[PDB]
C-alpha cells in the first residue's frame, strides 16, 4: 500500500536531502531488492523538511523519469536544476 506525492522543493541552496540507490548501484536501506532512488536523510531545518521523508522513492524530478536511472545521473540532475524542483515520490504505508 502506497501513495504518490507531488511536491515542490525550493533549493536554498541545495534541496537538503540525500539519495541512495540506482540501477547497477549498491542498494538502499528501505527496499533491498529495488534499484530505485530513495530519499535517505532529510536535513532537519532545510528546504525538504516536512515535505519529504526517509524512504520516499523518487520517480520523477522536473519531468525526468527516475525509473531505471543511475545514481550518478540522478545526483547530477538534481544538483544541476535551479530554484524550485518538482518531485514525484512514492511513499509506502504500513
Amino acid at each position: 500500500s502506497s501513495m504518490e506525492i507531488r511536491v515542490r522543493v525550493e533549493k536554498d541552496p541545495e534541496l537538503g536531502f540525500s539519495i541512495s540507490g540506482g540501477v547497477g548501484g549498491r542498494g538502499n536501506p528501505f527496499r533491498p531488492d529495488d534499484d530505485g532512488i530513495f530519499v535517505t536523510r532529510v536535513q532537519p531545518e532545510g528546504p525538504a523538511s516536512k515535505l519529504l521523508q526517509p524512504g520516499d522513492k523518487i520517480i520523477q524530478a522536473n519531468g525526468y523519469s527516475f525509473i531505471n536511472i543511475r545514481l550518478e545521473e540522478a545526483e547530477r540532475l538534481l544538483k544541476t536544476f535551479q530554484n524550485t524542483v518538482e518531485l514525484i515520490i512514492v511513499r509506502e504505508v504500513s
Partner: peptide, 7 residues
C-alpha cells in the same frame, strides 16, 4: 553497503 549523496 548502500551509500548516500547529498543534493
Amino acid at each position: 553497503r548502500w551509500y548516500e549523496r547529498w543534493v
